[PDB]
Design a protein around this ligand. Structure first.
Ligand code: CYC
Ligand code: CYC
Ligand code: CYC
Ligand code: CYC
Ligand code: CYC
Ligand code: CYC
Ligand code: CYC
Ligand code: CYC
Ligand code: CYC
Ligand code: CYC
Lengths: 160, 161, 160, 161, 161, 160, 161, 160, 161, 160
């Protein structure tokens, strides 16, 4: 979070919190209300967002749901939708925390090794996250849509 | 280390749930108590040194620790204090800025009893000094912000002893 | 400044700026419109605030202008007043800048090493910057005082 | 290194001048446009590998550089050239964010010229790759940050050449 | 129809008084919540069709209503029912914007009960659909305008039933 | 008010409020404090405004206070002054509302028939209103004067 | 007639749902505001007659209502006032004991305009008299309990006019 | 509710609320928190109470679920359980209201006519309500159990 | 009909061309005069009937037109002529707001000359009245709106004559 | 345009423009500068947008350039690109006008009979327009991107 990233940074120099750091912590606590509201709005519509994102992903990359596809079958498709739900949850965690620190440790470090072991298309997963971003920004006002989509673009860039 | 924001996320991620009303209420409480904490942090800063001097005079000095044999008898043992302290401040000012014990248990209060046992260092004296600093900071900070600073200082003293 | 502090960390860890770092970089600028007049107001008092703080400080500590004192003589007093002006200019520079960068990089890293061959009281500079912060805030409003107080706290929090 | 802000601070501290109307005008001119810098930097960070891909495809590969006898020949040299590609892109993004090529001079151009001379690197090929980077970045970011992004790529190309 | 401001003005004009402290406090009470209402209205307008789709899925379709013998059977009746849902949603949005159910009384509920009884429409099913739309709208808008949105849906439901 | 006018058009077209209409409502609620200030100033200074507008109308046309005039006599002129007070209250209401629905529904529809029945000079009433225009604009700043005078000119136009 | 407790139950019964969090919040709010209502009811009582006399002096008397032709010109027309009033008290003291408009609409303010239109009885005057009692009861009752009494009196006046 | 039964009782005599009635209203508002907690506790366990009470009722009176029984068949049994849930809801309404006024108007007046028309055993319904009372009292402390059970015996006596 | 913005669009749409620089300059020239047009329109709207009164006084009445044998004789013909003047004033205001005489050609000048000659209306007297209106409007508006106000009046007079 | 459909409404009632109409006729002229700049920006990149939109359109729906496709052949795809240029011109016209008024007359009313007589796929042309929307918002700032995406979405919805 912003608090963790600020306090530990002013602890590696053996000084108190910087007068420059008795700021953006301030903007974080000021915008925490909006962050909580945006996270709640995303959480209420988790099933619809996941379903529509999976639909768009399966149209745009139909090879994955073909017989030679990693997600071929009803339960392999259920697992793909479960992964999309996991990443939506991580995005909400990032939104509430105000930093991508929690999502980074939870679902990004080693994701390349995991998906290479499972033989899953990482570009396909990234496109699924993009579809989730589109469906999420369709349900939000412009400022909140930009704020959520900025984390969504972080996920897309990191899975790369 | 962890704050309230990170703690809620961590204990809601292990069970794999989205943030519900209780988690939102806890985050709401921390966000509502997010300005007095920042003000009291700046108040503790700057006036840190006078706080340390007052705490030392109130608890440490004028006792066994200063006469021959004490653990603060000479200079450089007086100097290892003010140091030793400035921690227990610094830290727990971090705690009452990212409020959670966490930092106090991971960085300051962890093996400190072993170090003091291997280096002399009267633990009862160094906890009485903590409570003196608690009193002086409660005096300086204000009526309502005296609490939760008292909370983190009590956590430090209790954990040490 | 804040941009320098963020880019230094980013290049040290060998990565682009973060998803919580740009939120702070953008919030550093949106209050710059307000802060420009805040640091501006202290600018056109620079030869007056120090002049008054001389009258707040060397009567408080009268040994600074006594025969065993370091500031005996008109030229010796002029040096201390010029030092106060230097500190006022640097704190205004940091107010315009963001993080502690302008003061710490120029006239804060090595105060003790300078005065080690200078014989100038650090506990006297403590009260000097205390009085500087004491007299430089009444020119501002409480809204500006809240955006000026931490910037003044860093001097007496660092030299200690 | 320096940005526009700290460049103004140092340029006034060198003669000991307080911030005046002209200096505050420069700071205002920097502050009014950096938000587009933030958006362009975010877009570049999200599309870093794609920009390198199109720049290499347009300027370097499908040539004698990737064939035997070329400098980019073999996977080791290919990975080295793409890492240099990424480094140029990242430092160009840092320079555009800071609004000053001081970081580019301090950490990019220092030693790169005679280093490439001692290593056999084709400076014309690197310049062409940098301009392909600038073309792709200008296409991606849009009119708002196109010239600000492109000026530092031109700075890198002129320093190398 | 009348809103908060016009309601205050009319209820002071009919008694021939000037704007006093009570009416002034009422009007700033409306003014303070202006942004939340307009934001919720924009969200509802952008998500109009999805709300109706989800409410119909939860409360009406996949039942005996859409089978033969149900009132919602046949394309004509299905289109009319979703049109009625759009009616209720749009008028609830207007009432939320104006802060007054007078528009609901004048242009929604007047004679609606007798019209539905004449046509054979299931009033209980209509109230269930209105409540499903209220739940979806409360989900979308968030706690900020959830209560204000819900009070007018509840007014519509209580008037119909 | 502006809310009612937007809602009426939206209901007429059978569509939710447009983004432009929402922006208009946002601007109107932004201007609310200024509108309240102008209304408060006019309400506080209404009596002097009424007396001066009456004097101006009378010395523009003294015939109304003549033997064959409609407003001949003390109680005959008190009614004209009360009517002027009525339209001043109405224009204050219109100022707070933001558009002329309350003024239209209270004091201009059927006013031709009422004044024809009473045999009172409608153009004389219009000049009396314009006197109130001058006296009221004399007690406000320039853009506030323009704002109030726009409603006053609306009343002048609606009279004839 | 309905109070808050009965109103919530009636609203939640037509749609056939158990009492959820929102209903328990409304009932909890009424239960928390259940002592000031009882105290202010007793305060309105006892000092009822002086309240009516002061309100009559403040609004009704010293006007055309007492001169020849008025609707309070003689006694027995004066006597129909104090009566007429003592209602608008009595009721709305009931309202700010079982707080909901309900009673004020079902027993007092329903056809009262028709009766007054058939009997003379200036409605504007009897609304000014209501606001006078609103002021006097706000003065007598207290700072916090001045509101909701102001609410019920304003509801009565607005409904009558 | 008690407020309804008290205010209207002091309205049939044309007097204010009696000092004898500026009491137990007070006891009701004092015990409102306990009543709300008891109602919420009953509401949370509505399905378990209904299921177990229906089980006990069908063991005690197996004739109703026999071929010649009113509640024979899966959907006829579903209707019986729905009626039991309805009466549990009415009991919670009575508990929150503090009086049996709402449950009386909602589900007691005319119940004899309705159940005689449907040919349902009223003693069987009463035994079902008794079973619901036992299951509900098994989940509550002694005071709260007595408080809810007293309304349960009211329903049992009224269906008689 | 079309305004000043949809008139350039129709010119560039019958050629298939995009909006080149000249179109942008034309639209800029229109946009720069937006506020003055609105203020002039408000002034004419507020002073409409007085304008017709002065125009009739200066151009039509006190002549043989209002006498027997004239085309202004009799109250019906006088009322018709003043209504025509009102329509001309209002459409002149519309044309001045739109920055285009397209509405004037479409909704006023079509068939008007032949209708007037089939009725015997003196076109010269009509043009004189329109010119008197233009003089009064130019007097009222001031220097800012006089010329573009008068251009549409002269357009109407030229179309009639 | 906003100008044309505000004088028309006033003329439909035969009145002058209202107070609530002369203020909405000012926001549009204020945003006219931004609209002109956006239209010029889109006009500058007209050929790149057309070519890339054609590329994504053919990738998404290759059946149109299949032998059993309307646009099979170099001249048929040239005509498809010309229609694309036409629609981009209409979108720029709508952006400058501020309303969709000119584009409805020029290229929407009757387009169904248009492409039914020509045997062209409406969903294919809609997908081409959506590819244009993506390419266009790739070359604009966020607010301007939303403003242009409004008209692009209107075109997509109207072609349906
Ligand atoms: C500037 C005054 C001019 C004038 C006025 C005049 N008025 C009356 C009588 C009445 N005027 C009104 C007016 C209103 N009722 C409304 O509701 C409103 C708007 C809210 C208005 C403006 C009414 C109702 C009356 C009737 C009497 C009453 O209500 O008490 C008269 C008296 C008529 C007579 O000849 O007896 C006059 C003279 N006369 C002038 O000369 C002035 C230009
Ligand atoms: C100074 C006025 C001159 C004058 C005029 C005059 N006009 C008529 C009758 C009509 N005028 C119109 C006008 C219009 N039709 C339109 O569409 C518009 C613009 C939208 C206008 C202005 C029409 C249609 C008629 C005929 C029907 C009607 O009378 O409403 C007359 C009456 C002629 C008669 O008596 O039969 C007159 C006198 N006459 C003059 O002397 C002036 C120069
Ligand atoms: C002061 C009130 C008491 C006291 C203390 C004392 N401490 C030391 C030496 C050390 N203290 C520390 C402490 C810390 N290291 C950490 O990392 C932290 C938390 C972040 C703490 C609290 C350590 C490690 C040392 C040893 C190494 C060092 O000196 O830096 C001394 C010196 C002992 C000696 O002479 O060898 C003293 C005296 N003395 C008193 O009288 C009080 C009871
Ligand atoms: C073929 C079985 C697989 C495949 C390959 C593929 N390769 C390229 C492009 C290049 N490949 C190389 C390779 C080398 N350079 C070296 O120095 C060595 C070591 C001797 C090798 C192997 C290079 C340099 C290129 C770039 C083009 C160039 O040579 O100038 C492509 C084209 C990718 C593109 O985006 O254009 C492809 C497709 N593709 C498959 O599907 C197989 C698994
Ligand atoms: C790529 C577009 C071109 C190319 C490059 C190439 N570079 C090397 C080796 C090095 N490149 C660097 C670069 C930097 N040091 C710095 O500090 C910075 C900026 C921060 C840069 C960009 C260095 C230090 C080396 C030497 C060590 C290393 O290899 O990492 C090679 C390898 C040469 C070899 O084989 O010995 C190559 C090929 N080659 C092309 O064809 C392009 C024109
Ligand atoms: C089948 C060839 C195509 C298709 C159809 C499809 N329909 C539904 C759902 C419904 N369809 C109806 C239809 C009617 N109701 C009527 O009264 C009439 C007139 C006789 C018709 C035709 C209704 C009411 C529904 C709603 C569900 C219900 O019946 O209760 C679906 C399901 C969609 C969903 O979101 O669940 C589908 C898929 N889909 C295709 O792709 C075919 C081209
Ligand atoms: C007093 C401030 C004003 C006023 C009043 C007035 N009222 C009457 C007569 C009646 N008033 C009532 C009222 C009510 N009956 C109800 O049930 C209720 C609510 C519970 C009300 C408010 C009725 C029914 C009557 C007629 C029967 C009766 O007198 O009880 C009069 C007498 C009229 C006459 O002489 O016939 C008067 C004067 N008069 C004023 O001047 C004040 C504005
Ligand atoms: C006189 C008793 C009243 C009066 C009158 C008055 N009239 C005018 C001006 C005009 N009157 C007419 C009248 C008619 N034209 C017709 O065709 C008919 C039907 C036969 C009539 C009655 C006209 C046309 C005019 C205009 C001038 C003209 O005749 O050319 C005025 C002058 C108004 C002005 O602004 O100059 C006046 C004063 N005034 C009173 O006070 C009496 C009650
Ligand atoms: C062998 C080296 C050595 C010395 C000398 C030493 C001194 C010493 N003097 C102290 C205090 C003190 N010392 C003094 C006073 C004085 N001090 C003087 O050297 C003067 C003779 C006198 C003033 C005229 C006072 C008043 C205090 C109490 C703290 C205070 O001043 O507030 C303390 C702090 C602990 C305490 O209160 O006893 C130290 C460390 N310790 C060492 O290890
Ligand atoms: C025809 C029979 C009749 C009478 C007389 C009558 C009187 C009457 N006197 C009144 C007031 C009043 N009357 C008086 C005073 C006086 N009253 C007297 O008879 C004395 C001469 C004098 C005292 C010496 C005062 C002071 C008031 C104002 C109310 C008050 O005292 O507070 C009022 C209340 C309304 C008002 O203020 O005008 C009435 C109705 N009504 C009737 O139907």
């Amino acid at each position: 979070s912003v608090l963790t990233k600020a306090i530990v940074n002013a602890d590696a120099e053996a000084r108190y919190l910087s007068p420059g750091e008795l700021d953006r912590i301030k903007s974080f606590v000021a915008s925490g209300e909006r962050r909580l509201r945006i996270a709640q709005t995303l959480t209420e519509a988790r099933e619809r967002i996941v379903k529509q994102a999976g639909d768009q992903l399966f149209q745009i990359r139909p090879d994955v749901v073909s017989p030679g596809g990693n997600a071929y079958g009803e339960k392999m498709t259920a697992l793909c939708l479960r992964d999309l739900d996991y990443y939506l949850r991580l995005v909400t965690y990032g939104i509430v925390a105000g930093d991508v620190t929690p999502i980074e440790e939870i679902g990004i470090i080693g994701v390349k090794e995991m998906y290479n072991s499972l033989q899953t298309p990482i570009p396909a997963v990234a496109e699924g996250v993009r579809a989730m971003k589109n469906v999420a920004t369709s349900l939000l006002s412009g400022d909140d849509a930009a704020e959520a989509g900025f984390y969504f673009d972080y996920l897309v860039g990191a899975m790369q | 280390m962890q704050d309230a924001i990170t703690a809620v996320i961590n204990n809601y991620d292990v069970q794999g749930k989205y943030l519900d009303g209780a988690a939102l209420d806890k985050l709401k409480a921390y966000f509502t108590t997010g300005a007095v904490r920042v003000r009291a942090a700046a108040v503790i800063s700057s006036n840190a040194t006078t706080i340390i001097k007052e705490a030392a005079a109130k608890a440490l000095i004028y006792s066994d620790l200063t006469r021959p044999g004490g653990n603060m008898y000479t200079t450089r043992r007086y100097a290892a204090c003010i140091r030793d302290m400035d921690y227990f401040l610094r830290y727990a000012t971090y705690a009452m800025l990212a409020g959670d014990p966490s930092i106090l248990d991971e960085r300051v209060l962890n093996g400190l009893k072993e170090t003091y046992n291997s280096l002399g260092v009267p633990i009862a004296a160094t906890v009485g000094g903590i409570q003196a600093m608690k009193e002086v900071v409660g005096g300086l900070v204000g009526p309502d912000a005296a609490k939760e600073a008292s909370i983190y200082f009590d956590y430090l003293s209790s954990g040490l002893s | 400044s804040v941009v320098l502090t963020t880019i230094m960390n980013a290049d040290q860890q060998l990565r682009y700026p973060s998803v919580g770092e740009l939120e702070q970089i953008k919030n550093f600028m949106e209050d710059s419109a307000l802060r420009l007049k805040v640091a501006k107001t202290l600018s056109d008092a620079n030869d007056r605030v120090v002049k008054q703080a001389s009258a707040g400080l060397f009567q408080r500590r009268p040994d600074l202008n006594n025969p065993g004192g370091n500031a005996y003589g008109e030229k010796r007093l002029g040096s201390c007043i010029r030092d106060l002006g230097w500190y006022y200019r640097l704190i205004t520079y940091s107010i315009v800048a963001g993080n502690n960068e302008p003061v710490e990089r120029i006239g804060l890293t090595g105060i003790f090493e300078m005065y080690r061959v200078l014989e100038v009281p650090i506990p006297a500079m403590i009260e000097s910057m205390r009085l500087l912060k004491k007299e430089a805030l009444e020119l501002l409003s409480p809204a500006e005082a809240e955006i000026a107080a931490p910037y003044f706290d860093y001097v007496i929090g660092a030299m200690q």
